[PDB]
Write an enzyme that holds these catalytic residues in place. Structure first.
Site, PDB file in Angstrom:
ATOM      1  N   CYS A  25       0.807  -1.077  -0.115  1.00 20.08           N
ATOM      2  CA  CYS A  25       0.081   0.098  -0.149  1.00 20.08           C
ATOM      3  C   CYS A  25       0.962   1.301   0.066  1.00 20.08           C
ATOM      4  O   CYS A  25       0.538   2.372  -0.684  1.00 20.08           O
ATOM      5  CB  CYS A  25      -0.968   0.211   1.263  1.00 20.08           C
ATOM      6  N   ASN A 182      -7.596   4.491  -3.305  1.00 16.83           N
ATOM      7  CA  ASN A 182      -6.976   3.261  -2.701  1.00 16.83           C
ATOM      8  C   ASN A 182      -6.358   2.486  -3.770  1.00 16.83           C
ATOM      9  O   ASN A 182      -6.398   2.931  -4.956  1.00 16.83           O
ATOM     10  CB  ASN A 182      -8.361   2.570  -2.059  1.00 16.83           C
TER      11      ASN A 182
HETATM   12  C1  7AS Z   1      -0.325  -2.018   2.925  1.00 17.81           C
HETATM   13  N1  7AS Z   1      -0.503  -2.572   2.441  1.00 17.81           N
HETATM   14  C2  7AS Z   1       0.290  -2.213   4.652  1.00 17.81           C
HETATM   15  N2  7AS Z   1       0.377  -1.094   5.550  1.00 17.81           N
HETATM   16  C3  7AS Z   1       1.687  -0.358   5.647  1.00 17.81           C
HETATM   17  O1  7AS Z   1       2.538  -0.808   5.149  1.00 17.81           O
HETATM   18  C4  7AS Z   1       1.614   0.873   6.548  1.00 17.81           C
HETATM   19  C5  7AS Z   1       1.582   1.977   5.963  1.00 17.81           C
HETATM   20  C6  7AS Z   1       1.245   3.357   6.633  1.00 17.81           C
HETATM   21  C7  7AS Z   1       2.495   3.959   6.724  1.00 17.81           C
HETATM   22  C8  7AS Z   1       0.475   3.278   7.867  1.00 17.81           C
HETATM   23  F1  7AS Z   1       0.484   4.012   5.794  1.00 17.81           F
HETATM   24  N3  7AS Z   1       2.980   0.806   7.263  1.00 17.81           N
HETATM   25  C9  7AS Z   1       3.243  -0.244   8.463  1.00 17.81           C
HETATM   26  C10 7AS Z   1       4.740  -0.764   8.142  1.00 17.81           C
HETATM   27  C11 7AS Z   1       5.609   0.089   8.175  1.00 17.81           C
HETATM   28  C12 7AS Z   1       7.192  -0.174   8.184  1.00 17.81           C
HETATM   29  C13 7AS Z   1       7.334  -1.603   8.210  1.00 17.81           C
HETATM   30  C14 7AS Z   1       8.836  -2.177   8.177  1.00 17.81           C
HETATM   31  C15 7AS Z   1       9.114  -3.317   8.861  1.00 17.81           C
HETATM   32  C16 7AS Z   1      10.439  -3.623   8.912  1.00 17.81           C
HETATM   33  C17 7AS Z   1      11.521  -3.078   8.136  1.00 17.81           C
HETATM   34  S1  7AS Z   1      13.017  -3.376   8.433  1.00 17.81           S
HETATM   35  C18 7AS Z   1      13.006  -4.433   6.796  1.00 17.81           C
HETATM   36  O2  7AS Z   1      13.307  -4.339   9.468  1.00 17.81           O
HETATM   37  O3  7AS Z   1      13.870  -2.373   8.345  1.00 17.81           O
HETATM   38  C19 7AS Z   1      11.084  -1.724   7.815  1.00 17.81           C
HETATM   39  C20 7AS Z   1      10.020  -1.372   7.751  1.00 17.81           C
HETATM   40  C21 7AS Z   1       6.453  -2.588   8.151  1.00 17.81           C
HETATM   41  C22 7AS Z   1       4.993  -2.298   8.353  1.00 17.81           C
HETATM   42  C23 7AS Z   1       2.581   0.129   9.607  1.00 17.81           C
HETATM   43  F2  7AS Z   1       3.280  -0.877  10.456  1.00 17.81           F
HETATM   44  F3  7AS Z   1       1.605   0.544   9.727  1.00 17.81           F
HETATM   45  F4  7AS Z   1       3.549   1.174  10.281  1.00 17.81           F
HETATM   46  C24 7AS Z   1      -0.576  -3.383   5.272  1.00 17.81           C
HETATM   47  C25 7AS Z   1       1.040  -3.560   4.630  1.00 17.81           C
END
Ligand code: 7AS
Length: 215
Positions: A25, A182
């Protein structure tokens, strides 16, 4: 700011995409914001490559999720992002296959909307273009949205879990709203869109993690 704005009417918005089973997303939201800025600056409307972001943004988690700001920072540091045509979406993470020959946009940094401030979000949408936003999209009410202005008292701003694109705002029958693109395909919502309550105490946390790229 105008009372209403709809960037679809200015040709700043590409068709609705479907992220599929991949948690990308954030990549769709990011490319949507970049697409709006590319159109504004250069006159070109084109699909940018969410796959490029999924595979190459090391500070995100590919299909596990990510932040839009990390994507903008990547495009800036990388000195480009490919077009969709040059780096197609396959719905799962690949090795990074970025190619400068397919470059279609650049990024000069990003800006964050002050947390919780819907007036600032409105000003940003009006002045800049489509803005990337985060919401709680976990509720069945959101899944089943069809018409009207969406509001659910159970929406929880501590549960920001989904990234979408604010392409405008306005009012419908006295109900102020954000126009939200979306990435769940065109058979979700109203042809892939939802009108979400605006100025209703930051419904679903819509102004909590909003950002846009510089170009
Ligand atoms: C979209 N299909 C989805 N939501 C998200 O990706 C959300 C979106 C937001 C920012 C709320 F609009 N973000 C999630 C998220 C953010 C960061 C990571 C993440 C995990 C691990 C690493 S690492 C590889 O260990 O460096 C980096 C980034 C995961 C998820 C949220 F948790 F909401 F912040 C459903 C997936």
């Amino acid at each position: 700011a105008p009372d209403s704005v709809d960037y679809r009417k200015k040709g700043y918005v590409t068709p609705v995409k479907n992220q599929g089973q991949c948690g990308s997303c954030w990549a769709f939201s990011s490319v949507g914001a970049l697409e709006g800025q590319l159109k504004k600056k250069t006159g070109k409307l084109l699909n940018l490559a969410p796959q490029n972001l999924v595979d190459c943004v090391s500070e995100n988690d590919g299909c596990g999720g990510g932040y839009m700001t990390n994507a903008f920072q990547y495009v800036q540091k990388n000195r480009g992002i490919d077009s969709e045509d040059a780096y197609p979406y396959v719905g799962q993470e690949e090795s990074c296959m970025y190619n400068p020959t397919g470059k279609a946009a650049k990024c000069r940094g990003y800006r964050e909307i002050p947390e919780g401030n819907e007036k600032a979000l409105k000003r940003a949408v009006a002045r800049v273009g489509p803005v990337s936003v985060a919401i709680d999209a976990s509720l069945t009410s959101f899944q089943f949205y069809s018409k009207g202005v969406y509001y659910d008292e159970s929406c929880n701003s501590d549960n920001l879990n989904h990234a979408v694109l604010a392409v405008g705002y306005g009012i419908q029958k006295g109900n102020k709203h954000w126009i939200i693109k979306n990435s769940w395909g065109e058979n979700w919502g109203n042809k892939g869109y939802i009108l979400m309550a605006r100025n209703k105490n930051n419904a679903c946390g819509i102004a909590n993690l909003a950002s846009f790229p510089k170009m």
